[PDB]
């Protein structure tokens, strides 16, 4: 199936309190595997997966220096932005970037991304064509010109279709046993009392991977979406995920409801009753 290499980057200024904090966090699919935190004791690129320990000193040193280069580059960007936006030097500010690539089964780039945000708002992003930019506001237009004049979209097109794809191949290779696995979810229904002779049936899905899953409650046929409460799939600390969907039903009538779990790790979907 498809796979992706994404990096979440954050640069947040701390005027008066010191130097900006810079972080680079990387993900191969739903797994964190690398991180760089400038607020760390000794700022080095660190492996966040056991399989990345296969990478040697040249990798770690090369990545560390690159991270430090980006860090120093964002410190310049932060100040630059204050000007574009007529901002005082007192406030704290944040620049975020999502950068990565998704390749399909055949190995062709399905999607490449490079998008920026400032203070939680879209700033500028590379388009689908990997040739043009979309600026979010007046200030972004300045960067857009600076980038067109620099042939930046070309540089990125090269990274996305080239380097990004090659490295994703090396990662999936080095950690195939972990990254290409599939943990089927274990589900169970919990009962809960409440006012007006009502009850809360909560369907739980635990210990699965990858993160995509579907949980639905049904009244013997119909999927109760509108009248069902549920949380966003969330990490459980050891590389797997969990989720739950609840529905409030009239007491004594719980035995008419079924929960259905849909996940790629199962031969057939699961069906549970309290």
């Amino acid at each position: 199936g498809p796979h992706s290499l994404r990096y979440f980057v954050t640069a947040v200024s701390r005027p008066g309190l010191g130097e900006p904090r810079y972080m680079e966090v990387g993900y191969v699919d739903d797994t964190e595997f690398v991180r760089f935190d400038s607020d760390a004791e000794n700022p080095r690129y660190e492996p966040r997966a056991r399989w990345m320990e296969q990478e040697g000193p040249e990798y770690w040193e090369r990545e560390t220096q690159k991270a430090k280069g980006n860090e120093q580059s964002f410190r310049v960007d932060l100040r630059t932005l204050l000007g574009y936006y007529n901002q005082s030097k007192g406030g704290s500010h944040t620049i975020q970037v999502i950068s990565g690539c998704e390749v399909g089964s055949d190995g062709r780039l399905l999607r490449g991304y490079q998008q920026y945000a400032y203070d939680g708002c879209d700033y500028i992003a590379l388009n689908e064509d990997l040739k043009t930019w979309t600026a979010a506001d007046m200030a972004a237009l300045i960067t857009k010109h600076k980038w067109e004049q620099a042939g930046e979209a070309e540089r990125l097109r090269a990274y996305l279709e080239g380097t990004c794809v090659e490295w994703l191949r090396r990662y999936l290779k080095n950690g195939n046993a972990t990254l290409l696995r599939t943990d089927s979810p274990k589900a169970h229904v919990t009962h809960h009392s409440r006012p007006e002779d009502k009850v809360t049936l909560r369907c739980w899905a635990l210990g699965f991977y990858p993160a995509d899953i579907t949980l639905t409650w049904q009244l013997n046929g119909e999927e109760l979406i509108q009248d069902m409460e549920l949380v966003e799939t969330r990490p459980a600390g050891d590389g797997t995920f969990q989720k739950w969907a609840s529905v409030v039903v009239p007491l004594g009538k719980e035995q008419y409801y079924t929960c259905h779990v849909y996940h790629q790790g199962l031969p057939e979907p699961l069906t549970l009753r309290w």
Binding site: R62, K66, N70, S99
Partner: peptide
Amino acid sequence: SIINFEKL
């Protein structure tokens, strides 16, 4: 490997 960024 993440890309090296350009200035805004």
